């Protein structure tokens, strides 16, 4: 399915569920708190 927190997500390409911000600095997926 999606990812969750911590996980490598790239961003642009929304990897993660709808619930996270994908960093641009290492892909990793965050809260977007």
């Known amino acids: ?3 969750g927190f911590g996980d ?3 961003p642009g390409k929304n990897e ?3 619930n996270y911000a ?3 600095k290492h892909k ?3 809260v977007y708190l």
């Open 1 to 3: 399915g999606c990812k």
């Open 8 to 10: 490598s997500c790239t």
């Open 16 to 18: 993660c569920c709808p």
């Open 22 to 24: 994908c960093s641009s």
């Open 28 to 30: 990793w997926c965050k």
